[PDB]
Design a protein around this ligand. Structure first.
Ligand SMILES: [Cl-]
Length: 262
């Protein structure tokens, strides 16, 4: 109902929280405009209005494909607020894909998972080479689900090299105790079915759970749960909160860019 609302609230505990959305949108727009025809915007992966992805190409032959899946608790944002985060990987020669997806309550989280699979699959036809995945928050959840062979085709999964869920939701059960479940509309079995900690079969890939040191206790817990279940690597980013933890993606030399492209 609402017992865990405060526990899962990020913005309320982040100084300047209100300023992130507008600045991301502005930063992303400027980046797209800067890239000219190396920005392939609004490529379709499906028929729906939000079944689109942006594909950012490096200057030379891409060394591979990096898919970034954005967050917003599966109920807000689209791909357009995050383009500028393609810079670090682009500088190392990776093509970078960013999908949008339909949002709850129009769809269920399980349907969103299926859409990300469709998106990764489409991007993987555009770019040859190894595939690396990163995703933030709900997006961290979504990239974690891509290692499920029942979700993503073998031909794509076989190519996944690294998966880096940044501040992921790994166990959806506690969300049943949040008002956001009025939108997700999950019962216990649905939360379990969509929880990465429950996945026993995974494509072979180096998984590194990346979480901010100054994040909500709930997010620190969600991270270590994933680390425990999968024996994944684990990085705690010094003094980072839920909104600036992703900032190093813009920096070619960041440790976050390094673990994603390793
Ligand atoms: Cl669901």
């Amino acid at each position: 109902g609402m017992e865990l609302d405060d526990a899962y609230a990020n913005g309320a505990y982040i100084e300047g929280a209100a300023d992130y959305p507008p600045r991301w949108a502005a930063s992303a727009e400027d980046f797209r405009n800067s890239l000219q025809d190396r920005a392939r915007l609004n490529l379709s992966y499906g028929e729906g209005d939000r079944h689109k992805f942006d594909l950012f190409l490096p200057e030379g032959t891409p060394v591979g494909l990096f898919v970034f899946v954005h967050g917003g608790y599966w109920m807000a944002f689209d791909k357009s607020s995050w383009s500028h985060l393609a810079v670090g990987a682009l500088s190392k020669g990776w093509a970078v894909a960013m999908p949008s997806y339909e949002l709850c309550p129009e769809v269920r989280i399980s349907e969103i998972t299926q859409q990300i699979s469709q998106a990764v699959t489409a991007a993987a036809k555009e770019i040859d080479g190894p595939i690396v995945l990163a995703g933030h928050s709900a997006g961290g959840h979504l990239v974690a689900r891509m290692l499920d062979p029942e979700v993503l085709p073998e031909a794509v999964g076989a190519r996944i090299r690294n998966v880096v869920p940044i501040s992921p939701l790994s166990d959806l059960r506690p969300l049943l105790r949040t008002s956001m479940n009025e939108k997700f509309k999950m019962d216990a079995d649905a939360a379990i079915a969509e929880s990465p900690v429950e996945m026993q079969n995974r494509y072979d890939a180096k998984v590194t759970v990346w979480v901010g040191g100054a994040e909500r206790p709930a997010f620190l817990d969600q991270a270590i749960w994933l680390v425990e279940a999968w024996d994944a690597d684990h990085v705690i980013a010094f003094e980072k909160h839920h909104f600036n933890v992703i900032e190093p993606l813009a920096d070619p030399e960041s440790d976050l860019v390094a673990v994603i492209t390793a």
